[PDB]
Design a protein around this ligand. Sequence first.
Ligand SMILES: Cc1ncc(-c2ccnc(Nc3ccc(N4CCN(C(=O)CO)CC4)cc3)n2)n1C(C)C
Length: 279
Amino acid sequence: MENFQKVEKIGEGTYGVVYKARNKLTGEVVALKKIRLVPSTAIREISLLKELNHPNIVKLLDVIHTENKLYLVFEFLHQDLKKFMDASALTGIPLPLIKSYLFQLLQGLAFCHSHRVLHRDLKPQNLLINTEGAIKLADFGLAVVTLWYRAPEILLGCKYYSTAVDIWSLGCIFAEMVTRRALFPGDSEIDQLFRIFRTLGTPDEVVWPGVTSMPDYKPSFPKWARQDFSKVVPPLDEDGRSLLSQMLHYDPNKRISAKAALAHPFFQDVTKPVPHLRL
Ligand SMILES: Cc1ncc(-c2ccnc(Nc3ccc(N4CCN(C(=O)CO)CC4)cc3)n2)n1C(C)C
């Protein structure tokens, strides 16, 4: 760690704290994550991530493990998607750029999921962008906390959840890019669930076989009727609404995979625009 010079603080979680830093050595500018006070298991899983290289995953350059404390050195990107969404709020992110970002993140996920790696905690704050029009997944949740992008199976207590949880999260993010408003902004676990239920209908055995035997399922849940998607993400076009609805299917088994999503007609005219970024 003597090799790095802190420049500024760019993040905090209960993983750790992240700094923009400069290799004292030889000026790589990097993001430096100082991790949570390290068991053998953590080291090996993290070393597995160092091999998970893809253009749409923030590159893990190095793992420094000396003295019990753990540091992760990443390629630095200049902005997160949240700040870009906030900056773009009056006009909205143009659809071609939303679509490009969505396609790229689905490519990232397809790759991760093909290697049996789940993100688990997708949100605007851990999607990072650069001037070239790339978007990248960061802060792989390698297991106040935001619940807004949590899949319903997690909220209902599924222990052994699947790659579909990331598709759900990404769907919520897609909706948010389009409407410029969080789809399901819950501030507790039951509020989050009930916000989902109010929009998508209270799930039952018809749309989600086995839902009623999930650990935190309660028969006493209020029974809300589903709303139509034309109300939920106007003025998104039919292709986009079709894709979104498949990304938000209650049953993780019916939820569209990253790979199948890339073949959706919504991406027929996909391009790679450059965002105008003010750094
Ligand atoms: C967690 C984590 N692990 C590694 C990274 C990472 C990797 C590569 N590049 C970055 N760059 C960032 C991240 C965040 C920000 N902004 C966050 C929001 N912000 C604030 O001032 C918030 O108050 C401005 C900086 C700028 C560059 N991170 N991160 C990010 C998501 C904080």
